[PDB]
Amino acid sequence: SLALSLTADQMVSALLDAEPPILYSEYDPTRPFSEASMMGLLTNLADRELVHMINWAKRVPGFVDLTLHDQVHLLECAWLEILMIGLVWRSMEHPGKLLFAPNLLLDRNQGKCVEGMVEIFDMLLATSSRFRMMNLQGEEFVCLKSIILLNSGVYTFKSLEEKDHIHRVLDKITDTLIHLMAKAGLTLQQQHQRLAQLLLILSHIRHMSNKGMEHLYSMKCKNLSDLLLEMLDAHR
Amino acid sequence: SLALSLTADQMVSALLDAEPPILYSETRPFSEASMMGLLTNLADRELVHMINWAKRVPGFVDLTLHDQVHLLECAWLEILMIGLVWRSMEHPGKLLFAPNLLLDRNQGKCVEGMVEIFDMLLATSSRFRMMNLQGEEFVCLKSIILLNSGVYTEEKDHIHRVLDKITDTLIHLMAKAGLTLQQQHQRLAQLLLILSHIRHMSNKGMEHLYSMKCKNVVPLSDLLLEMLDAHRL
Amino acid sequence: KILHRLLQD
Amino acid sequence: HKILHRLLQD
Ligand SMILES: O=S1(=O)C=C(c2ccc(O)cc2F)C(c2ccc(O)cc2F)=C1
Ligand SMILES: O=S1(=O)C=C(c2ccc(O)cc2F)C(c2ccc(O)cc2F)=C1
Numbered sequence A: 001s002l003a004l005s006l007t008a009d010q011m012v013s014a015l016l017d018a019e020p021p022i023l024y025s026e027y028d029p030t031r032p033f034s035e036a037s038m039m040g041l042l043t044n045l046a047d048r049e050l051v052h053m054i055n056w057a058k059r060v061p062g063f064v065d066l067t068l069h070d071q072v073h074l075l076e077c078a079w080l081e082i083l084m085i086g087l088v089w090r091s092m093e094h095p096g097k098l099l100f101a102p103n104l105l106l107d108r109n110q111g112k113c114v115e116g117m118v119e120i121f122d123m124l125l126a127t128s129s130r131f132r133m134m135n136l137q138g139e140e141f142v143c144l145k146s147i148i149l150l151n152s153g154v155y156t157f158k159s160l161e162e163k164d165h166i167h168r169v170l171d172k173i174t175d176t177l178i179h180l181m182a183k184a185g186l187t188l189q190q191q192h193q194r195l196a197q198l199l200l201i202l203s204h205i206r207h208m209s210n211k212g213m214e215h216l217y218s219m220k221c222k223n224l225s226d227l228l229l230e231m232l233d234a235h236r
Numbered sequence B: 001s002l003a004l005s006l007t008a009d010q011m012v013s014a015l016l017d018a019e020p021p022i023l024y025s026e027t028r029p030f031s032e033a034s035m036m037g038l039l040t041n042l043a044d045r046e047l048v049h050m051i052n053w054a055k056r057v058p059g060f061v062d063l064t065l066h067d068q069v070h071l072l073e074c075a076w077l078e079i080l081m082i083g084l085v086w087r088s089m090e091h092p093g094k095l096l097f098a099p100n101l102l103l104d105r106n107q108g109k110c111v112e113g114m115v116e117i118f119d120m121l122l123a124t125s126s127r128f129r130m131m132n133l134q135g136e137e138f139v140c141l142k143s144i145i146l147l148n149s150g151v152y153t154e155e156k157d158h159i160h161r162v163l164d165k166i167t168d169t170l171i172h173l174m175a176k177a178g179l180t181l182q183q184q185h186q187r188l189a190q191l192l193l194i195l196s197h198i199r200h201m202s203n204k205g206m207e208h209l210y211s212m213k214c215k216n217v218v219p220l221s222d223l224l225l226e227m228l229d230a231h232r233l
Numbered sequence C: 001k002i003l004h005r006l007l008q009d
Numbered sequence D: 001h002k003i004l005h006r007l008l009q010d
Helices: A008-017 A035-057 A068-090 A117-134 A138-151 A161-183 A188-220 A226-232 B008-017 B032-055 B065-087 B114-131 B135-148 B155-176 B181-215 B222-229 C002-008 D003-007
Strands: A098-101 A104-106 B094-098 B101-104
Touching: A008 A138, A008 A161, A035 A068, A035 A098, A035 A226, A035 D003, A068 A098, A068 A117, A068 A138, A068 A188, A068 A226, A068 D003, A098 A117, A117 A188, A138 A161, A138 A188, A138 B181, A161 A188, A161 B181, A188 A226, A188 B135, A188 B155, A188 B181, A226 D003, B008 B135, B008 B155, B032 B065, B032 B094, B032 B222, B032 C002, B065 B094, B065 B114, B065 B135, B065 B181, B065 B222, B065 C002, B094 B114, B114 B181, B135 B155, B135 B181, B155 B181, B181 B222, B222 C002
Parallel strands: none
Antiparallel strands: A098 A104, B094 B101
16 A cells, blocks of 8 residues: 555655675686586576565565465566566666676677577577666656566456456556656657557567577476475476 | 558558457367367468468567567567457456357367466356457557567667657557547556466467477368467577 | 468568 | 565565
8 A cells, every 4th residue: 555655756765775686606707618507507597586686575565465386477477578678777887798797798609508598698688778768767766666576477367356456556667657757858749759669678578588598498308496496396 | 661650540450450350260069170170270370360460560660581480479469369358358257269160168178278378268258248349449458469579579769759649649548549548558557467467378279289299180271370389490 | 481471462 | 485475475
């Protein structure tokens, strides 16, 4: 209820203050890496990020007003989307490179170390170049990331009055995005165009998550942390 | 180019006039092979009309031949699904693949793994019902899927300007319906967020067709195999 | 290359 | 009771 009674600026400051930290990798550059090592670095990193993401989700306005079964469901469908949009956001100031960690900056040739990883790398890179071209703002980013959390699992669900509450919160995040674009000087036509451009990117983020979900499911059945396999079996 | 110098009302009528026809399927209880065959045959014939519909999408003919191929290869199942979901709006709990082929989720059990995709499609149709999706909005969403789905995989500046044009058309439609400024961008967001689920359904449907191509249960058409092979390289 | 042919027509 | 089920509580 308090999430609905939030002004747009209080919505932004709540999302900004809830941002998770940028974690570091175990990456030791004494080694050029094998496939298992580079995969171990990304797997260990994503496992520690999931713990922060879970506690980040509890501070998303309206997420706490949901039942525990619904919270588990939204996170199970959206966890990789949230990891990826964060990676893409961290990589905005590093063209042609993915900043997995401050000490783990990788280009596409290093992504070829893992079989099939290069295709997902280019998609992640193209998304980061898109955020760069649009000059995506951190206020817009935290809105998009919370939209993913509330949207990606809403149609994979009597009583269903909770889905109506989620849509009310989603409408509030939409109001917040327009409020930000109106403050930056954009005209009404420019606000609606930018709003559409940002939300169409979520379609590609869903695409990368689906492809990445198959890539991880292959690595499991080809020789990951327990929390990650538990998330990976949610797509099965 | 000409798509940009065109008004919002002219965008709607152009998209409406380009709408493909509703095709029919070719009575015997269903099995794994029979139901997969009817869906494969129906989808193969729908693809031929989609290709001619795409050429009538404003701005699509301005693209190069390779870029047209890439967009259709990336979005073909999305476009089939949003059309199926659109046809099934006035049939709650059922999927209208063809006028003579209306199926419920119990009939989706005739094919393994088909149930999960059926439930997602039925959920999207009920979402369109709850939102009271208009046909003018539907043809805008379908053309957005065509131009957007493959745009990240300048000729892209043209596609993005055409995409902005469709956003202006959607907002123009909502302002004609009497919606307020807040109701306009809210409904715009609600419609575009559905495209993320349509993409998710297509990816799940793409996995399912690759399994049947390997399981060799029903021979797929050469065009359908080419569209399916494009999602791996 | 069936898709190419169908786009030519 | 899964891991995610418990971390959401704690
Ligand atoms: O597509 S990826 O190259 C990117 C990631 C990934 C890892 C961490 C992260 O914060 C974001 C990511 F996307 C991963 C990823 C890789 C291994 C893993 O166990 C989990 C993952 F998510 C593969
Ligand atoms: O996920 S599905 O249950 C739905 C479809 C589908 C078929 C035709 C159509 O017009 C729309 C569809 F979604 C299909 C589909 C099924 C078989 C096929 O050969 C092509 C397809 F597209 C599978």
